[PDB]
Amino acid sequence: RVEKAKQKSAQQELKQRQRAEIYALNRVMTELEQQQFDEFCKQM
Amino acid sequence: LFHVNKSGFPIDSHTWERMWMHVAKVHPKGGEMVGAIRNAAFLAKPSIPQVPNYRLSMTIPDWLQAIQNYMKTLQYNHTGTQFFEIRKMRPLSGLMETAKEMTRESLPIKCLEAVILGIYLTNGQPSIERFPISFKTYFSGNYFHHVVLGIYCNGRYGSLGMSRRAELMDKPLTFRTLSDLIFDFEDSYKKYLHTVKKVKIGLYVPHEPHSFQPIEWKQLVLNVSKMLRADIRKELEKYARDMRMK
Numbered sequence: 001r002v003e004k005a006k007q008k009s010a011q012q013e014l015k016q017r018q019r020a021e022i023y024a025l026n027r028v029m030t031e032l033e034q035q036q037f038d039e040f041c042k043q044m
Numbered sequence: 045l046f047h048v049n050k051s052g053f054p055i056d057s058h059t060w061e062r063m064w065m066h067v068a069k070v071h072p073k074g075g076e077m078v079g080a081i082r083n084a085a086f087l088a089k090p091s092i093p094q095v096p097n098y099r100l101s102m103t104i105p106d107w108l109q110a111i112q113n114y115m116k117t118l119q120y121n122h123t124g125t126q127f128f129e130i131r132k133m134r135p136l137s138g139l140m141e142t143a144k145e146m147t148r149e150s151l152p153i154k155c156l157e158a159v160i161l162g163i164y165l166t167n168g169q170p171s172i173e174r175f176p177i178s179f180k181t182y183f184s185g186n187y188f189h190h191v192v193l194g195i196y197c198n199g200r201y202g203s204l205g206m207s208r209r210a211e212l213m214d215k216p217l218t219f220r221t222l223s224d225l226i227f228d229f230e231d232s233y234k235k236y237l238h239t240v241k242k243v244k245i246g247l248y249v250p251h252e253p254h255s256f257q258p259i260e261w262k263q264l265v266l267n268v269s270k271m272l273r274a275d276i277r278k279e280l281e282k283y284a285r286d287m288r289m290k
């Protein structure tokens with residue numbers, strides 16, 4: 001109903017927070033791999 | 045090396061803590077990078093991509109593009125922890141349950157996960173034939189294994205997949221022969237300064253919902269280090285002809 005949509009469960013909130021952390025981490029690790037790739041392309 | 049989540053979901057504490065311990069080592073900024081994420085008061089919630097749904101106004105190439113776009117939006121997984129365990133000799137029906145879990149969790153994936161997800165999302169179109177294509181390559185002192193999902197339909201070859209490199213995954217359904225597809229991958233690898241060591245072609249993957257046979261990954265294996273391109277072509281074309289005769 002109205003009330004249930006206002007506030008997710010602790011479990012739902014944790015799952016969403018972990019997914020946000022996974023994507024924040026994937027962004028920085030993708031950038032790091034892209035930098036190392038970009039660097040190597042110029043060093044050849 | 046990379047870790048695999050062998051705890052399923054919810055991810056257990058050991059697997060979660062190990063994920064962060066690993067990236068603190070790999071990333072130059074170490075614990076500073078990790079703390080900036082783990083201790084953030086607020087993190088942006090990534091949009092959840094909709095699972096592709098076929099519509100009558102799609103051609104087969106359109107549908108393959110929708111599927112590939114979904115996998116691209118999940119993103120290639122550079123976290124160092126593969127989130128979905130794929131035992132590639134498991135019965136297909138069990139791998140399809142894992143593909144369903146990928147669509148529910150909506151997390152980054154790597155190449156093998158993308159093959160399984162690509163099978164799942166094309167099971168509803170029996171005119172699309174799917175078969176794994178594997179490469180062992182050498183780059184900068186180390187060896188790398190990679191798999192993509194080969195596609196055959198109406199006299200053309202293409203592929204679906206995921207890779208950290210843009211040219212090692214999806215290929216349009218415009219290759220007139222299997223060899224032309226394989227050599228496009230080889231030329232892509234060579235532009236990335238990889239050397240191809242082995243090519244493996246699997247069997248067509250059944251579409252039926254509860255198939256209990258494993259995927260066959262290496263019906264044809266080519267060790268290409270001392271093979272001429274003309275001889276690689278002859279073997280691939282003989283094998284492709286056998287695929288199409290059933």
Ligand SMILES: *[C@@H](C(=O)N[C@@H](Cc1ccc(O)cc1)C(=O)O)[C@@H](O)C(=O)OCC
Nearest residue numbers: 154155156188189190191206207208209
């Ligand atoms: C298979 C996979 O993701 N393969 C990698 C292969 C690769 C390509 C290019 C470079 O430079 C390095 C490695 C990919 O396509 O990104 C996947 O399931 C896996 O985990 O393999 C580990 C290499």
